Design a protein around this ligand. Structure first.
Ligand SMILES: OC[C@H]1O[C@@H](O[C@@H]2[C@@H](O)[C@H](O)O[C@H](CO)[C@H]2O)[C@H](O)[C@@H](O)[C@H]1O
Ligand SMILES: OC[C@H]1O[C@@H](O[C@@H]2[C@@H](O)[C@H](O)O[C@H](CO)[C@H]2O)[C@H](O)[C@@H](O)[C@H]1O
Ligand code: CA
Ligand code: CA
Lengths: 228, 228
C-alpha cells in the first residue's frame, strides 16, 4: 500500500487466528539536558527523524501487550526541569512507576471500526502525539515487523505550544476491517497529557474507551491485505 | 520524478534561454515568544510542516534574485532573547538590515556541476538548514511554480543542538546538467550561521564559491526534464 496519508485508508483482513485485545506499547527514556542548560528540556523530540530512528538510541524501559480501554491521561507535575515519578493508567498494563515528566512512548496495532462511514478522530497532547493510520501509512497488513520503520507522512499530529496542541483526522472506514495504527508520544518536561477519541456519522456518541476497537494481529508469512 | 531522496538524483536540461546567475531568495520574519516566556525563542521552526506551509504565515521581508558566490555566514549576536540587527553577506543581494538573530530564509534554483562523479556536500547551521536536491525531491524541472510546495524527504539537514549540527549529502552528478535545489534556513535566537560547501572525486579542492554553479531557470510550458 502507498505510504501517503488518505481520507480512504486501506485496511486488513485477518485469518482465523483470533485477534488479541489491545495495542502493543514500547516505553523509552527521554533525558533532560545537563544541569544549567537553557532551556532544561531537550529539543530532540522535534528532530524530524526522532519518531523513526532517534528514539531507538534511548533506554528501553518496557515492551507490553494488551493496551486497551481508555488510554487518555493527564499527569500533573509539581516542578519544572525535574524528572518526577508517576504511573500510566491501568489501561496501559504497566504497573511500575516511570518518569512521567520525561519519556517517549510508541503504541501500535489495529483499529477495528464498529460502523461503516466517516470517523473523526480528535487528538491532543503534551508534548507530542504523532498518528499514522492505514495500511502502508502506518505499516503493512500482518507484516508489521518488515515495515514498522517505513511509516509515511502523519495523518494527524499535535504539538504542545503550537497555535493549538489539537488535531483531527477524518477518514471513511469499513466496519470489521482492521486498520494499522501507530501512535508516537513524548513528554519533554513537566505535565504530560494524551487524548485520543473519536466520533462517527452514525450517532453523537464520543468514544473514549477502545476495548472493542484496538487489536493486535500476528504477522504471517503471506500478510493479510484487505479483501473487501 | 519521484520525490524521494537518492544517491543518483535526476536533473534538468534547459533550452536556449541563458540561465541566470544565482539562486532566488525569500526572507521571512521569525518572532520571539511573548516577553517572559521560557524559553524566549519560539519552537515553531521545528514543527514538521514549518518548512512547507508554516513559514508562509510569517511577515514576508524580501524576495530577491541572483544569490551566488560564497553564501556562508556567521552572525555574532551580543544578547539572548533579543532581536538584533545585522546584514547578510553581499552574495545575498540584499542591502538592508534585518533581525539576523531571528529570521527564516528560503533559497531555490539549480546546481550545475563542473565535473561528472560523486559530490559530497557538507552543511552546518545555527539553527536549522534543510536541503532538498534533485528533480522531484526539490521541485520539477522548469516547473517550479507548480511543484514548489511538494518537495520530498530531506537529502540532508542540520539542526543546532543535535548530537552534531552537521550533515553530508553524497550524490553522483553529471557535468552541465542543472539539478533542482532548495535550502531552508532558520535562526531562532542569538548567533546565526550557515555553511554550505562541497568536494568531488576529481581533486581535493573544497568549493565554497558557487559563482559557476548556482543558476535560475525560467519555468516553461512543457518543462525541461533531463535528457541525458
Ligand atoms: O504548562 C505545560 C507545559 O509546561 C512546560 O514546563 C514549564 C517550565 O518550562 C517552566 O519553567 O515552568 C512552568 C511551570 O511554572 C512549566 O509550565 C513544559 O515544558 C511543557 O512540556 C508543558 O508540559
Ligand atoms: O550558542 C549558540 C546558540 O545560542 C543560543 O542562545 C543562548 C541563549 O538561549 C542563552 O540564554 O544565552 C546564551 C548566551 O549566554 C545563548 O548561547 C540560541 O538559542 C541558539 O539558537 C544558538 O544560536
Ligand atoms: Ca510536557
Ligand atoms: Ca541561533
Amino acid at each position: 500500500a502507498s505510504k501517503d496519508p488518505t481520507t480512504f485508508p486501506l485496511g486488513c483482513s485477518p485469518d482465523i487466528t483470533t485477534p488479541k485485545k489491545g495495542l502493543s506499547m514500547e516505553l523509552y527514556s527521554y533525558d533532560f539536558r545537563k544541569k544549567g542548560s537553557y532551556p532544561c528540556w531537550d529539543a530532540a523530540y522535534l528532530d524530524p527523524n526522532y519518531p523513526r530512528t532517534g528514539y531507538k538510541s534511548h533506554r528501553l524501559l518496557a515492551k507490553v501487550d494488551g493496551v486497551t480501554g481508555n488510554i487518555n491521561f493527564y499527569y500533573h507535575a509539581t516542578k519544572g526541569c525535574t524528572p518526577q515519578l508517576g504511573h500510566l493508567p491501568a489501561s496501559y498494563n504497566y504497573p511500575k512507576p516511570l518518569t512521567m515528566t520525561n519519556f517517549t512512548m510508541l503504541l501500535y496495532g489495529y483499529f477495528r471500526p464498529k460502523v461503516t462511514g466517516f470517523h473523526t478522530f480528535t487528538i491532543s497532547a503534551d508534548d507530542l502525539l504523532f498518528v499514522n493510520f492505514g495500511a502502508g501509512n502506518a505499516f503493512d497488513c500482518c507484516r508489521r515487523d518488515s515495515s514498522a520503520d517505513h511509516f509515511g507522512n502523519y495523518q494527524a499530529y499535535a504539538i504542545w505550544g503550537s497555535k493549538t496542541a489539537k488535531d483531527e483526522l477524518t477518514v471513511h472506514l469499513d466496519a470489521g476491517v482492521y486498520y494499522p495504527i501507530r501512535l508516537f508520544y513524548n513528554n519533554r518536561e513537566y505535565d504530560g497529557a494524551l487524548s485520543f477519541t473519536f466520533k462517527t456519522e452514525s450517532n453523537e456518541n464520543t468514544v473514549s474507551d477502545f476495548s472493542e476497537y484496538f487489536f493486535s494481529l500476528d504477522d504471517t508469512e503471506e500478510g493479510c491485505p484487505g479483501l473487501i
